[PDB]
Each structure stands twice: as C-alpha cells, then as structure tokens.
Amino acid sequence: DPPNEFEAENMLGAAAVLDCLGVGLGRELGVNIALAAKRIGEDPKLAVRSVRFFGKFLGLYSDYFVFEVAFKPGKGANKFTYLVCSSLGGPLTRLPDVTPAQVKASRRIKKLLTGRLTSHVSTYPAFPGNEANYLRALIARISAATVVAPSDLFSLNDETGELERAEDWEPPAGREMAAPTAWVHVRPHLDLLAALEEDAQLPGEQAAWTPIYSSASEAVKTQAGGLRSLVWPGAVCGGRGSEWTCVYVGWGVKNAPFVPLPPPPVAQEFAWGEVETQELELK
Amino acid sequence: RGVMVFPDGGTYVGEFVADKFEGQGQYRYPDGSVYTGSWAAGQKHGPGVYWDTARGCLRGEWKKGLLVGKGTYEQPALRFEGEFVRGMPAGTATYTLTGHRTLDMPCFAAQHIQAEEGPTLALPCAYGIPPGSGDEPQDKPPLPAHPKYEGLTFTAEQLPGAAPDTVFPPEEGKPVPITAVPAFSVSTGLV
Amino acid sequence: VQLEPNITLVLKHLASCGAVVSAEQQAALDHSIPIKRIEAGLRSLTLWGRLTTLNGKDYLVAEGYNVASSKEGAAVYETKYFYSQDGARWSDLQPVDSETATRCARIKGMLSGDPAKNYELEEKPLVFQIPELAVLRCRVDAIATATSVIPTDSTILNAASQVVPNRLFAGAAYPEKLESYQHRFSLPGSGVTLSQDLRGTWAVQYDAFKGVAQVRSLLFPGYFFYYAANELTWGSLYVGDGLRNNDLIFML
Amino acid sequence: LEKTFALIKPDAVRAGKAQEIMQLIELNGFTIIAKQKLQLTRARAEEFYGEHKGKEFFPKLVNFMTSGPIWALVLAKPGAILAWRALMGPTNVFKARAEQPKCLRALYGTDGTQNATHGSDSPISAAREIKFFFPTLSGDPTIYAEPTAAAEYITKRI
C-alpha cells in the first residue's frame, strides 16, 4: 500500500544543532529517533498529518520516548495526540486525553515515573488517574511552557486561528539566538506568540531562560545558540544557521520550592447564637 | 446525654453542659467528616479523632476549636507527626512514607527480596509560618488559608532514614465512622 | 578488563541519559586530558562531570589520582580535581576547609558561571564571603562521597596493601542487582555494596540482550553509571547543577 | 560435606525468576556445585518420581514437570539437606504464605503443585537424585570402598 504523506521538521539537523549546543540525546539516538518518526508518519492504519519528537522522560524501571502527532476534544490542550514507547521501534501506546482536573491535581505533587503506565500515583493528594494520566498531565504542563519557536517565523492567522510559517524569515547569527528576545511560545498558555523574555522571573530578578553557546570564543564564525529552561530542567531550545529545534529530556520534575500539602481543613459547626433554648418569663 | 440535628444537616450525639457541647461527643458534618472526641464550651477541646472527607484521620489535642500542639495525620501510606499552631502545621515534624507504587515490581537488590523489613522511610522536617501571624487575637500578616497557603514554607535539609512499616487505618481511630476508607499494609498493598 | 574508564565509551553509553557534552568541548577534551595528566604526574585522570551555570559557561570538572591505599578500613584515593570552562585549559580546584564546608553547603541555586564571584552568608551580624570555586569544590565533594560507583570485586589489594585493578575480574554475575556494584572507597572483600545504601536511592535498568546496565542516582539526580558486561567496561559521569534531592521521600 | 539436589520448576522459569532464585540460594551461604537447564521427557520424568506410580495427582504433576525447561542444581553447605528445605519452606504455597511470608515458595509459588522448587528430603534420596541427574560427579568412593562388598560387586560385574 502507498505510504501516507506527512510533514515534519529536519530531525537530523535537530540532532546536529542539539549536539553542537551540548544538550539532547546525542547523535546516534538522533538517527534512531528520526527513523522511528519516519516509521510512525508513514503508516496507513494511522493517518498522521505531522509527527514531532517531544522528548524523553526518565523512569525507575523504564523510560518514555514521546511523539506528538496531529491526525489529519480536538482543541485547546488536546489539539495533539501523544504516543509513547519504552524503546525506539517497539509497540506504541496512545496516551489518553488530558482533563483540567488531573492537570490541577498533578500540579500539587512531585513524583518519579515508574516506567509502567498501569501504576498508581498518589495516596494522600489523590490523583484521579493512573501513571498514564500523570504523564499526560506532565506533557501538557511542559508543552504550555517550553515548546517555542524563533520570533517572526510564525504569524497569527486571524480567521483560521492558526500559524503561518512565513518564508521570508531570516535567522540571526547563532550567538544572537541565545537571547530570550528571539523566541516565542507556540502553545496556548494552559497571548500566544509572546516572547520568552516576558516570562515569570525566578526569585531574585532572575530570568527564567539561560543562554547556551556552541563555542567558548566569540570569534568562530558559524556557531549555534540557544536557551535552557530554569523552571523545567531538561527543556532546551536552540538554532544553528537556518535550523532550530526544541526538546525536553529529563525526569519530569519542576524546579520550584516544594511544599507538601498540609492535612485538609476541619469543618466548623453551626453558630450557637442562632440555636439556643428559649424560656418563658420567671416569677 | 443528647442527640441534636442542625438545619445544615450536621448532627451531634454526646454530652451537653449548659446549652453547649461538653465532654464526649460525635459530630457528623454535612460534608461527611466525623469528629469523635472531647468538647468544652461548645467547641473541640481535648483529644479527639477527626476523619475527614479525604478519608484520612487526624488525631491530636484541640484547644478552643483548633488543633494545637503535637498532632498526627494519616493516610494509607503516609503519616505526618508534627507541631500545629492554630490548626496550621508550624515547627518540627516527621514524615513517614511507604513506597506503594512499586510493591509488586521487582526489587533492585536481592537483599530486599527476603528482608523482613519494608520499604518505609522517615524524614525529619519543619513547616514555617510568617512571623507576625501565629499569635492569638484579642497589623500582622495573615495565616495561610486553605487554597493557596500563602506564606507557608517547608524546610528539610537532612537525609531520611529507615522506619517501621505503617498500617492503615490506625487502631487509634477504629471504629471507623465513615465509609469508603481503604486499608493499606505491605503484605497486601492498597485495598 | 579495562584499566581506566574511556571517555568515548562513557559519552556513548550515557548519552541516552542526557549526559552529553558539546562537540567543541569533546574535541578539546580529547586533546587536553593527556596534556594535563602528563604535566601533573598523575597515573589516572578522567572527566568527572559538568555543572551547569546561569551564564552558559558550564564548569567541566576532571578528577585524577596516582595510587589508592587501604587506610583505616577505607580505600583512600588521593584525588586531585581540576576545572575548566572551555575544555582546553585546566585550572586547579583547591580543597576547602571544614569550617567553610558548612557555609558553602548552605548556599543553593545554580552556580553563576563567574569564577571570581563570591556569595554572602550571615550569622550571629557577621557576614562571610564564600568564593564560587569553594561552592563548586564542596558540591563536587558531596557528590563524590555519595556515589563513586565501581563494580564489585573489580579492585583488589596487593602486597604493599594498595588498591589495584583486579586483572582477573570475570564480571558481575547478576548485573541487574545492586549487589554487583559498590562504592570506590569500600575495601575489597568487605562485603559492603550499594545494597547497603539507603533503600530507594538507586535505580538500575539492565538491557539483558545487549548486556548494558545503567545505574542512576536518585539522591543526586544527574549521576549516571554504566556497566557493559560483554566487553567488561564501565564508567560514570555527573551532569547537573550539583544540588542534592531532599524531597526524595515524597517522590518515590 | 553435605550435597543436596535442588530444582527450579517451569513456573519460576517462565516468570523470569531463575536468576533471582539462584542469587538468593547463594546469598544464603549455599554454593552451587553444578547447574543445568534441561527439558525433561515423559518417561524420564516418570522414573524420577517412580515411587509414586500409584498416586492420584501423579499425572497432574508429571504433565506440569514437562511444561517447560527446568533448572537442576546441586547445592552444598555444612548441614545442607535441612537448610535447603528450611529455605524452600512449606509445600503448600498458601500455608507457607501464611506462616513464612518471606520464604521461597511463599514468593515464587502459586499452587500446591506450582511451588517453583523441589529439594531432596533424605540423604539417600538426595544421592539417588544426584546420581540420576549428574551421573559424572563421583559421590563418596570412600564409603563404597568396602573390602567385602567389592568382591560381591565383582560377581555382579562378571
């Protein structure tokens, strides 16, 4: 049967850019990931429009490779579908759709993934789903904050409500891509194309995105640039020349002061001023 | 002795003194939480057990309504023993947690497979409250309310250590006065 | 049986765990490590790790030593550390006093990336100024005394009571169990392995078909160790800001 | 020194737990003199349990002891016969799971016949099992070197 068509990014170029910046998963795994995304995108029984590689989540007994597809409820934070695997080339599994309840409930805990999807998550701060739902909530929260793109590459199409990849976009020098004023968000905040410079600063007037460079000398002429996330350690964006990419590799844990949930409040009683025994007059 | 029913749906079965609760009493709140304990002047006072809607029991010694002093809180694989200031935890505490998610997944060391001790930990820690608050009214920063707990801090900077395995529900709480409370151990997991 | 970890194999096996280095830094290391190893008179010198900074100039840290000896029931390695910010020129990473060790232990956050910076602490109000390289050395010391993983019975004691490679080492019988690995500073034949550590601070993933085990530290997330059993090689690397994970009881 | 004959049955082998069982055997001071992973036939599995030809559950067992590959082991320790059985624990998986929750059969057994192990019970039976499975290992030429029984064994050989 004829393989279906699909759009994607230059993934070998993404592996090259990440390797030049010193992040990601290397370049042998870059090849394996590109071939796996090919085997996904060219599948008849799965009519995919576009494939992307979200990143990798490290677990205790296994790991999660995560691909983000588009498939030719279906909007907001469920616009994309997510397929995960333990090893590249193994059988894939579609993650469920995310609900605001489990996003809000995972925002209160901090767990290590066990690498098994059919595992419990929490006892006291009750998480409504199993591990798969926690993973989906993590993916949603990370996508809302880290997936970005170079500025002026996309524009907001009013009527269709989508993004227009302009074809007169010129990248700056690689070492100028390491500024937070050179990237913008391309996922709804959970307005849209806001620069990374206007993020929530960390305690101490510290910017939430830190530069990464490809060479220690400012005189090399063709070098990459990029940013690394402070809030989500393991989330990196970076461009070299005309190519660029975002990815997340890590454990899934946020970088914020963690306060475990206190015991829940205790209920009060009825006001005594309105429930009191009456009496008749005295002699 | 008395039995009382309030227009919100809350009920009380216990002892009264001069038109208010006093002594032993069990109160059932509209939410489904049950407080079985000691009262004085129409409010919780003394040692009582409070099963909450989240199906977890909070013990301790209330004083003028609020849990004050050393208090323990329990859930299937959790236990928090710590100081409480005006119902809010503040000060020294100890968190005891068991790893329930991986009780049936294979162990990393062959020493644990046959060891008669479970995978429980124990961490000394402390909670923290804005300085001006915590006093008793008769400005100052406000206490940490429920949704946000704005101002509540938490500090732990030592290692955890091993601990004896926990069980749920704690026998200090039986007989259980609500429904849908699970049962946790290590030879059985969560039930 | 290897005689010393190979940085190429380390970077190849631990790349899936995100423990990677830049390409320029990789080439620069390939040149710079032998130079420094020779001009310092050391028998062994390897890449220990890479600590991320706020200005993008991560600290590469290298560790070397000459001989390890058994003293007071511990296999003591007289190690010497060097740091770098480009991979080409190595500077010394001098030890820190015990009194300053506590102060630098109190300093948290990601390092600045400016070796001339110094942080401030306040005590009873006496203010101390702690240089950044002191903080770096202290974090490296903590991570080192926590992990320093080697396989079990890969070392041995010789006639002069020194710890030398066991060249007749056959391999770990059960590579997926924590009993197969140990700390470096545990004497050979002492029976102390990683299973004696706090239960739950180590994770092991073993690919039984290719024969590659990966041991990850959960107490210091960022420390990775690999052991390849068909070729009998192993090696570790730290990559991260250097802070300990204190919330471990809530995350397991 | 005492040598006992052990066995890892197909249910433990299929679950991927023979390596864990051997590692625990050696964590408990034993020393595996010999190990082998074979597949027992029907007639040989009969002759192995040949003292139970009239037992009711005999076919139920013999059809299970051929359901896959097994691990035959020869263990050795000072006082090995009874220590091995103290390790395997009770024969009823549920009885064992009630009494010794950290026993071997209480961790890798499921049924009254799927217990995952089979030790010897008497030194006579242990020697017979070992000579049945490992006919190469020489067992106590000292004892069998009787100056009188040797002439009778010569009469047998002629």
Any chain B CB within 8 A of the CB of A60? yes
Could you tell me if C113 and C132 are in contact, meaning their C-beta atoms sit under 8 angstroms apart? no
Could you tell me if D139 and D131 are in contact, meaning their C-beta atoms sit under 8 angstroms apart? yes
- Tell me the three-class secondary structure of chain C, residue by residue: CCCCCCHHHHHHHCCCCCCCCCHHHHHHHHHHHHHHHHHCCCCEEEEEEEECECCCCCEEEEEEECCEEEECCEEEECCEEEEECCCCCCEECCCCCHHHHHHHHHCCCCECCCCCCEEEEEECCEEEEEEHHHHHHHHHHHHHHHCCEEECCCEEECCCCEEEECCCCCCCCCCCCHHHEEECCECCCCCCCHHHCCCCCEEEEEECCCCEEEEEECCCCCEEEEEECCCCEEEEEEECCCCCCCCHHHHC
DSSP, residue by residue, A23-51: -TT-SHHHHHHHHHHHHHHS-TTS--SBE
Could you tell me if C110 and A230 are in contact, meaning their C-beta atoms sit under 8 angstroms apart? yes
Could you tell me if A209 and A228 are in contact, meaning their C-beta atoms sit under 8 angstroms apart? yes
Phi, psi dihedral angles at B151 (to 5 degrees) = 110, -15
B113, B185, B187: best to mutate for the D interface, most D CBs within 10 A: B113
SS3 D115: coil
For C203, name the nearest residue in chain A, comparing CA atoms only.
A60
Residue A251 φ/ψ region, left for φ over 0, alpha for ψ in the -120 to 50 degree band, beta for the rest: alpha
B80: Cβ contacts below 8 Å, ≥ 6 apart? A263, B72, B73, B74, B89, B93, B94, B95, B96
Residue D115 φ/ψ region, left for φ over 0, alpha for ψ in the -120 to 50 degree band, beta for the rest: alpha
From the CB of residue A12, how many other CB atoms can be counted at a distance below 10 Å? 14
For B115, name the nearest residue in chain D, comparing CA atoms only.
D102
Could you tell me if B65 and B43 are in contact, meaning their C-beta atoms sit under 8 angstroms apart? yes
CA-based radius of gyration for chain B = 19
* Binary contact (B102, A272; C-beta < 8 A): no
Which has the closest alpha carbon to A235: A185, A174, A165?
Answer: A185
Q: Which residues of D are annotated as a binding site?
A: 9, 57, 85, 91, 105, 115
- Residue A204 burial (CB < 10 Å; 0-12/13-18/19+)? exposed
What distance in Å separates the CA atoms of residue C47 and residue C240, rounded to the nearest whole number?
14
**Binding partners of B (≥3 Cβ pairs within 8 A):** A, C, D
**Beta strand pairing call for A225-229 and C59-65:** unpaired
What distance in Å separates the CA atoms of residue A83 and residue A64, rounded to the nearest whole number?
9
Phi, psi dihedral angles at B140 (to 5 degrees) = -125, 155
The amino acid that residue D53 corresponds to is K
What distance in Å separates the CA atoms of residue A175 and residue A242, rounded to the nearest whole number?
13
Q: Classify residue A106 by its DSSP letter.
A: H
Question: What DSSP element (H or E) covers D156?
Answer: helix D149-157
C57, C90, C205: best to mutate for the A interface, most A CBs within 10 A: C205
Residue C63 β-bridge partners = C46, C81
A121, A123, A135, A278: best to mutate for the B interface, most B CBs within 10 A: A123
B119: Cβ contacts below 8 Å, ≥ 6 apart? B98, B99, B102, B103, B112, B186, C199, C200
Could you tell me if A131 and A121 are in contact, meaning their C-beta atoms sit under 8 angstroms apart? yes
C193: Cβ contacts below 8 Å, ≥ 6 apart? C152, C178, C179, C180, C181, C182, C186
Residues of B in contact with A260 (CB under 8 A): 95, 154
How many alpha carbons fall within 13 Å on the CB side of residue A266?
Answer: 26
Residue C234 β-bridge partners = C227
Residues of B in contact with D23 (CB under 8 A): 110
C160: Cβ contacts below 8 Å, ≥ 6 apart? none
- Residue C38 burial (CB < 10 Å; 0-12/13-18/19+)? exposed
Q: Which two tokens stand for residue A227?
A: 């940013």
What distance in Å separates the CA atoms of residue A226 and residue A243, rounded to the nearest whole number?
12
Residue D59 φ/ψ region, left for φ over 0, alpha for ψ in the -120 to 50 degree band, beta for the rest: alpha
Q: Domain map of chain D by residue range?
A: 2-157
A24: Cβ contacts below 8 Å, ≥ 6 apart? A15, A18, A30, A236, A247, A249, C18, C20
Could you tell me if C22 and A240 are in contact, meaning their C-beta atoms sit under 8 angstroms apart? no
What distance in Å separates the CA atoms of residue C231 and residue C236, rounded to the nearest whole number?
16
Q: Do chains A and B touch (3 or more CB pairs under 8 A)?
A: yes
SS3 B29: coil
Residues of C in contact with A23 (CB under 8 A): 18, 20
DSSP, residue by residue, B131-147: SSTTS-----PPP--TT
Could you tell me if C61 and C51 are in contact, meaning their C-beta atoms sit under 8 angstroms apart? yes
| Residue indicated by tokens 């995560």 | A66
Q: Which residues of D are annotated as a binding site for ATP?
A: 9, 57, 85, 91, 105, 115
From the CB of residue C203, how many other CB atoms can be counted at a distance below 10 Å? 19
Residues of B in contact with A123 (CB under 8 A): 75-78, 100, 184, 190
Q: Give me the resolution in angstroms, 1 decimal.
A: 3.0
b/e for A78-89, b at 16 or more Cβ within 10 A?
Answer: eebbbbbbbeee
Q: Which two tokens stand for residue C175?
A: 């590579």
CATH superfamily entry for domain D2-157 = Nucleoside diphosphate kinase-like domain (3.30.70.141)
Annotation says D52 is catalytic: no
List residues of chain C with CB under 8 Å from any CB of chain A.
Answer: 11-12, 15-18, 20-25, 52, 54-58, 85-88, 110, 203, 205, 216, 218, 221, 240-241, 247, 250-252
User: Which experiment gave this structure?
Assistant: cryo-EM
| Residue indicated by tokens 């359901």 | D67
